[PDB]
Curated annotation (Swiss-Prot), chains A, B:
The gene is lacZ. Inhibited by phenylethyl thio-beta-D-galactoside (PETG), isopropyl thio-beta-D-galactoside (IPTG), L-ribose, D-galactonolactone, lactose and 2-amino-D-galactose. The record marks 953 as: Important for ensuring that an appropriate proportion of lactose is converted to allolactose. Keywords: Glycosidase, Hydrolase, Magnesium, Manganese, Metal-binding, Sodium. GO terms for cellular component: beta-galactosidase complex. GO terms for molecular function: alkali metal ion binding; beta-galactosidase activity; carbohydrate binding; identical protein binding; magnesium ion binding. It comes from Escherichia coli (strain K12). This is Beta-galactosidase.
Amino acid sequence: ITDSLAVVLQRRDWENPGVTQLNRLAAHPPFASWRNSEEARTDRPSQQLRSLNGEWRFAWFPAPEAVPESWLECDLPEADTVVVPSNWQMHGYDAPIYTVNPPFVPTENPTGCYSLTFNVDESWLQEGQTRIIFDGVNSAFHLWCNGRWVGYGQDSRLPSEFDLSAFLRAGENRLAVMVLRWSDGSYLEDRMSGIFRDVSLLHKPTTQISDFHVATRFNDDFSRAVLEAEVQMCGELRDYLRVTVSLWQGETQVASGTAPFGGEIIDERGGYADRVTLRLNVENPKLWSAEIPNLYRAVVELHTADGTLIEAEACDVGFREVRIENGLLLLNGKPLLIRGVNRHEHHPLHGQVMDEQTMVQDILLMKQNNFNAVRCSHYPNHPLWYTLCDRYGLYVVDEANIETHGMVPMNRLTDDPRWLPAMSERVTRMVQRDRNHPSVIIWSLGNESGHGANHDALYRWIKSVDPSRPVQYEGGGADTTATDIICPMYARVDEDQPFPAVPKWSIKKWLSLPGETRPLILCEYAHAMGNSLGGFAKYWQAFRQYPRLQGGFVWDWVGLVFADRTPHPALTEAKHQQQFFQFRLSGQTIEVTSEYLFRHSDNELLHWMVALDGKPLASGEVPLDVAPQGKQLIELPELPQPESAGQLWLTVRVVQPNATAWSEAGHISAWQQWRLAENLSVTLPAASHAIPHLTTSEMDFCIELGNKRWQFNRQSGFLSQMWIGDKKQLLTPLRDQFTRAPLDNDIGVSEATRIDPNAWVERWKAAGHYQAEAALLQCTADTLADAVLITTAHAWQHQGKTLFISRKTYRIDGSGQMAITVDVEVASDTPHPARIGLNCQLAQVAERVNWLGLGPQENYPDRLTAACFDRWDLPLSDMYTPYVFPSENGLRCGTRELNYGPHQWRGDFQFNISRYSQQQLMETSHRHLLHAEEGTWLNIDGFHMGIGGDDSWSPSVSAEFQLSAGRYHYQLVWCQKG
Amino acid sequence: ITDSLAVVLQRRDWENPGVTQLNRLAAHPPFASWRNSEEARTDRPSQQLRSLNGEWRFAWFPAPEAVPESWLECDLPEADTVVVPSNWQMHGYDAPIYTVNPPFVPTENPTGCYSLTFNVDESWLQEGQTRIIFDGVNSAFHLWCNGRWVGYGQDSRLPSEFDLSAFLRAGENRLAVMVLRWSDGSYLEDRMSGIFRDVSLLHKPTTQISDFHVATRFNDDFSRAVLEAEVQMCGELRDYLRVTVSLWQGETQVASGTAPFGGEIIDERGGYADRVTLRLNVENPKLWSAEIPNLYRAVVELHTADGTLIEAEACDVGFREVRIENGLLLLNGKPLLIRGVNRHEHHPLHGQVMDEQTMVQDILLMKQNNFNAVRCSHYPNHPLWYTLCDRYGLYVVDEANIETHGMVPMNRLTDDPRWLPAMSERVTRMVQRDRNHPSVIIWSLGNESGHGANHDALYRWIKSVDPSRPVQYEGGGADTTATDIICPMYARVDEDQPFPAVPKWSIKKWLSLPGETRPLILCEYAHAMGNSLGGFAKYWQAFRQYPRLQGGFVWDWVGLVFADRTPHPALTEAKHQQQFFQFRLSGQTIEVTSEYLFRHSDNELLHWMVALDGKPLASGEVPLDVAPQGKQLIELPELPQPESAGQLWLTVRVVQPNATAWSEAGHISAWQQWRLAENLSVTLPAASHAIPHLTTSEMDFCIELGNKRWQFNRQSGFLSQMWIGDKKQLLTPLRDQFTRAPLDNDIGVSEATRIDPNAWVERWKAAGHYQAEAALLQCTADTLADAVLITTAHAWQHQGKTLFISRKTYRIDGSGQMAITVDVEVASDTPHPARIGLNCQLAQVAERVNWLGLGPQENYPDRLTAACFDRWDLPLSDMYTPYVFPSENGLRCGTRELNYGPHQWRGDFQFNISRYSQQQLMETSHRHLLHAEEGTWLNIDGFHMGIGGDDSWSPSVSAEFQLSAGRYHYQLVWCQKG
């Protein structure tokens, strides 16, 4: 018959861009079909919305032409039971991976056959309309109900609704869903097939609310608002039908309106008889923002003239105005600063199935790290996400599910009018679904699809239908006519990237180009792959200095956190750079500037502390009373002035004494540190009575002082062994190190098969930095009046070229201390080294690492503003960052003192300490393959290269963070317990 | 199987707005696939383009579900042979007439089943691609080739192409076309189904030119041009493929360019490898316009690197620039004045099948009547029409086939995103087909569809794809954001029509509204239904006075001409109002201003003539040498100054001594007449010796003078009979007439079932003008010294109210002359009468009508500027205008003398003379039902109402042309041969 798979799978609707759906209902805001208005007001669950999530029968087939006809009537015997909201590649049916003919898809199209057997009660079948809703099905699908074909759907990321009234019988019914892995829609979504979102049954009355959308208008000072609500009905029009729209703040009704159906005259033929526009006046409305997410409840009742209710719908309403004025994006008349992050829908252990608790955890983490905006990365999200962003407060950019980055002209589809219908569906249905949410402030036309005329047409469509929101689009150079905002991807603060026909100007230069008036917000910046986010403070200095630089979205929230939502160290950096209080020090006065636009600092307390080399001396706490965008002066008490040598540090932090909806009591939101005053140590070490004794064989230099011994290998010139009593302290000799295990930013997109030679790791490998051999040049050993002096000279050579020369002096005096001075010259023509330091493997393993230096968390020369100077004590495992792909990690900069076991190192250095060598980190592909080595590897660097982070496919370490000086000096004193 | 009608007619693609085609090829400019470039250059017929027009088998079925399956393989036995380019309602299968559920169409859908059996030669099947082209199929159709389903098509007014390569066999093949009368596309085309355009087979090579479009760029003074030609290939790309674009003026090549494939970089992924853009420099190009349609020939050759040609295409190229600047529409830098007309595709006797000769005849007639622009009324035309407009010179507005005027919100579909794909197809495919034509200067988004967001989206699409042409759209008030031109329908010169939400301002007021900067061109004005076009001169006075009033398109070319292309009298008016030479008189000097923008008057000769009461006295001829938009002064020779009584008239006309492509030698293009000087007649009639003798019975007054007798009925008061010798001269008594047979403008849209009371005919009927009865009040008869005086008074009364009073004097002197003075008073509260005159039925029928008065053609008080004062002699049949719906017709205004048979009437009057009474014209629905009456009906009016013409659904007669004075006087002398 006509419902057999032979007839249905004959036109190949999945290989036709002109067919994106069959028998699919219109798009609309989410509906519950409440039959009592009190349940709609309180958002209570509706008896008319029945979830079909749960156990479904599933079968897998290589191609759609391999499914038996009997599947249409009876479930297959070998079918496996699954939970329908899921991806079938989470169960071992076909292999998904991360990674040609625009209309055609491969003939071997993996096919999932879902089926459900369910009861429909008689009341639903007696009257009204029953529909099935698929919140998301990846690629395309065909639907059968009790063996009769219903319809066809595409656009995985938006709901597909089908009228099931004529197909449902009494009692048991069977739904059969054939889901294809690829369709023509895959060319706009350029894996992970299946029914990955919720499946529901909705019952509406015969006459019903078919649509409704709300808008807010304000006077000049936002003290008066008009809420306009347009309501569309479908069904049989009657003269007694009424629509009431009521606005509620809590349990208190603030406005209400009622009217029959029939709108104003639109043109010569009249108006809409099935539509009604109600206008509600709200005096002194509580405005919505991310800082204070004030919400109202709008209840729309379709009833009769006498008063019996037919059906009620409801939504949350936020009174807020978004507009671009004089080149500035304003919310409620104030210039926004977007502390945004890009976020994909990725469950920690369920693929693309997003549940409520994961969303709440993510929102809490983002708000706790000073994010106020989120970008729906390249497709519309679960509808619950927008509700949660309304309720907690987060600016949302809603993005159409259009992504054609694989195209070689890259606008081949988006400049073709034959693809205009498919793109128009993906834009219009998203706008029709999500236009009522106050959190959504910007529409995005999609991601990386070039710039065609379809983009301009859809941009103009959105501007006509919804003028309340700006439209942004990155594509064709991030500044085309299809965007209201210049929205570059990974443009840099100061350095231009003049690519042909799509240059990435520096954002400062981009703002001032001839004729350019628009605000700039980066849709993607600060790529967080691996050990990254160097140079973030430069971006935020630019954001705060330039009015039309209004922020951006950091790429990949999850990423800034691990899959289990464990935070990356760079997240701390972001939290510090995006904090809402800026601090200035002048003498003994702290100026606190609030970066809040709307809220007073009513839950803020300023704690301060003064410390000398990590030892606290004075502290206090001052309540903050700062108006939005205002300033508060805090005069400090007379600060201590110690006579003891050391450096005075003043730390201030902002604490929230009370808990909020998103933070616990005592939450730290902002902080800052200053150097107050330094006293230089002029006290001399008291002269010792003993003198270290030197013994010289041809093999080694041996120095003895009490129970301590130092042995230098004369063949190699390096300190080879150390003895306390009779215990050897070293496993590997202390030797110079100029390389690091490459980071994701060092590697770039360089591949073993496809080498990119501009990458840092490629330049280091070609120069022979990893294969350079140390050759001893001079070695002298002398006894002074009160010490022993060892001097050595080493040259590192590769293929006849000297890359580095290291000259070192070792002074061992009568107190047991060993001072090491290192002077290194680097050839100007070799690539700048990743580091200049010393490396050794300590024989003993200790539980704790103590250090007077910067920060508790890993910090680097170009990512260290969020670290504070103090005395830190951590477990050894806390000194290693478990990046998925192993690399150099765990460095602590600005370190004056390091204590590990019985060993102390003093000076001015960076260090990392771990159980993994740089060699093992380089040669291990995944972090689970790492194995702890016998002792502790210590890397003490005098100098270290920046890590970059602007992007991960080109060098991004700024010149001020490269080791280009050519000559380098450092000193470190090594002592033991005594 | 899957090709059976059961499977194919199951998804009901004709009831789904989301399916407008299946397996349809892309849109492109017309292709011939020439295999030798010399044939492409000379536009010789191509052997690769084979017409399938001719004899086809046809069957008719009530519904698509009534067609037998056997039709798919064998032709039906009862099938009738027809010519395929035709409408099947021209053969009696279902009834077409002139005159609910947006997706659904009636289930009783009349279905035409066409079939063709044809030979395909082996060479086409060996290699290459063979496609079938349907230039037009009304509504929707399904296609089968040799029993296998090919595809589905909609959008009747654009070609549908299908690849037939896999379906064609050797020798005989059968095509089966199922054409439905209605589809969802009918909601955008709101009859006359069938295959009404040409059907062709096109053979292209395996690698082929798939697209090409040309653009012209100019410097500031148009002395240098760059022709940019973008060429798109489809097929297998090779490194030796080359594209050559050559430009030819006649047989002389002016430019040429060659390049391999591969365009410039468009974005990060590169450019188009299958596209090439060639730039050609043309120095001092001959510019295209309607006045001088200079054309070049562009030949595009796809060949190899060695030189063998693969395939050639060609087009005509016009170098011209269209832009809107400072609110003015400029062509080649000059402000256009659009002398336009709306033209439907309507064959005189073949329905909607348009052939070449009809197009050429229409273009010649339009150019001969001073039209320079044509509007494709509501759909794209036959592709040959645009070529003919390129070659002869006519500005063309190309309109999308979108028309939803039946919708009750009237933007219900065009504001719905679910209808955006269907509308986008109709716009994009038209632009893709017609963008290379120089005649097309404006894109139109459609007709009467309200204003939705789809209109804005498609407007922006056109502006992105083709910035070389302005986009206009009437809908939602004719001044929305979806139009570059204010393009009202039937807006008036001075009177506003403030409708709710779509006001029709006066065009003068519309121009100056706050914030309005755009030019105004009426897409429809001067409705020409029936006896119409009154007030046209007001429109053209406004056009010439106001710079931003740049003309308009007169509604319905065919209409301004009858179906057989016989011209309406108002066409003359249009020709006079749109003439390109304006004339001013000052003393004896004529100032001639040229309205041409580009051409010198090199084929123009000014003839002049001076006449006294139609008797010529002096004439001459002066060559015209006028620069574009310049002036020429012509001093007249010493004009005659007669002493004889009469009025001197100066007539000038512009003659084209040489023939053109569109006009014959001696063509008259412009003319003008002035009154020079009048001499009043002060000579007295010599006193007569005889005196008319009066005899008075109670029944009548009888007056005798020689052989002449006049008899007045004393019961009625009217002159009842006249005798010359013994022959009665009258059949109906000479009586006052205040009514006329209503015109289409008098009736409006008033209907017998649906009466519109504001219409003029309704107001006259309600007032009793047609039923008013004359009642004699006074009647006196006296004998003077040398005459007889009859005085009568009549009152016209209806339901107790006196509407008109007529007082008349009759003076019969000794020369046989009868002077009649008429004084009429009209009640101020009755509607103003259509006329005030006398009416009689003359007993004799004469061959000719002679008159000293205005014009040879029918002219009216508000349509008479094109009539000239002279002595005119016409046959009686020339005095009747055969309007399809009979009405008042044939009036000649400004008439001083009228001669008919032996009768002469002198004075200052209007008249019409015919064989049909006003009563018969009123009571006859169609002109073929009219029958000539016994004698001649003469209507001599002292005063006549204007006819209107601004529209035909509301009163449009201006107040200066209504008979509102309340009192009226006229005089007429009636004499006979003597």
